[PDB]
Amino acid sequence: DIVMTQSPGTLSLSPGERATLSCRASQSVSSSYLAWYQQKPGQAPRLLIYRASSRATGIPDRFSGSGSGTDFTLTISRLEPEDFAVYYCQQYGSSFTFGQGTKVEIKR
Amino acid sequence: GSQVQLVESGGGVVQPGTSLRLSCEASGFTSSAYAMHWVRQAPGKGLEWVAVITFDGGYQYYADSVKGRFTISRDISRNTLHLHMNSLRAEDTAVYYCARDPLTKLLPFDWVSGGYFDYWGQGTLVTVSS
């Protein structure tokens, strides 16, 4: 029932730039139970953040999650070549629902 | 073994209205100790949660798009997860991922809090022909 919406649809950036990704829930997310995933082309998703701000093991410091209530943010302080991918948010405060994804692609 | 692995199988080209069973073999962890999920991704679209089975095996929940047609089950003796899909429709075309959830323990209702997905398989593609 909780609808998750991500903005923007696509970010076109050069390596080294900062990326700020937004995720909005239609209802407040209980316990700030919000996760972020990275999905590279042709690969399975990879957990980046859980509980809105906790980094998963092995995730570099340049990734940070923040926010609460309905509005959440994933920040990549400096894009590395391996960071160009699709990013998804997922709430688990009430059942399990994903955002539609934000594509971070190399600027050409 | 040493690394955690999730390996899905069973995908292929299937005709509308038919049935198909997918399997997910886990290694490096005991799948019966975790909530286990199926998550699918239609071509060009985002991730869609499909189904969960709790660690006790007694609770299952499903997305509205598949409820009544799909069944999630587990073979504890073989460390395997299954998705039984009936009455396949064109909108079921997707790669189907098996995923582990280290947080979810109790799910008394379909609206209570759940968990996140810390390990994923590589996926198996199901294509409903036309």
How many contacts (CB atoms, under 8 Å) link A and B? 65
Which candidate in A32, A96, A97 is best for mutational testing of the B interface (most B CBs within 10 A)? A96
Inspect the interface and report whether the beta carbons of A37 and B117 lie closer than 8 Å. yes
Q: Tell me how many domains chain A contains.
A: 1
Inspect the interface and report whether the beta carbons of A96 and B103 lie closer than 8 Å. no
Comparing CB atoms, the residue among B46, B49, B118 nearest residue A96 is B49
Query: Six-digit token pair at A17?
Result: 């730039």
Q: Count of CB atoms within 10 A of residue A85's CB?
A: 19
Distances from the Cα of A9 to the Cα of A105, B95, B100, angstroms: 11, 22, 28
What distance in Å separates the CA atoms of residue A17 and residue A74, rounded to the nearest whole number? 14
| Structure-solving method | X-ray
Q: Count of CB atoms within 10 A of residue B22's CB?
A: 21
Q: How far is A70 from chain B (nearest CA, A)?
A: 15
Q: Count of CB atoms within 10 A of residue A73's CB?
A: 17
Inspect the interface and report whether the beta carbons of A94 and B112 lie closer than 8 Å. yes
Q: Count of CB atoms within 10 A of residue B39's CB?
A: 27
- Phi first, then psi, for residue B32 (nearest 5°) are -70, -10
Comparing CB atoms, the residue among A44, A50, A99 nearest residue B120 is A44
Which residues in A lie closer than 8 A to residue B112 (C-beta atoms)?
A: 94-95
| A100 SS3 class | coil
Which residues in B lie closer than 8 A to residue A74 (C-beta atoms)?
A: none
B1-13 b/e (C-beta count within 10 Å ≥ 16 → b): eeeeebebeebee
- Resolution in Å equals 1.4
- Contact by Cβ (8 Å): A55, A108: no
Distances from the Cα of B65 to the Cα of A64, B47, B85, angstroms: 33, 13, 12
| A81 SS3 class | helix
The range of the structural domain enclosing residue A77 comes to 1-108
- Contact by Cβ (8 Å): B40, B83: no
Inspect the interface and report whether the beta carbons of A98 and B47 lie closer than 8 Å. yes
Inspect the interface and report whether the beta carbons of B111 and A94 lie closer than 8 Å. yes
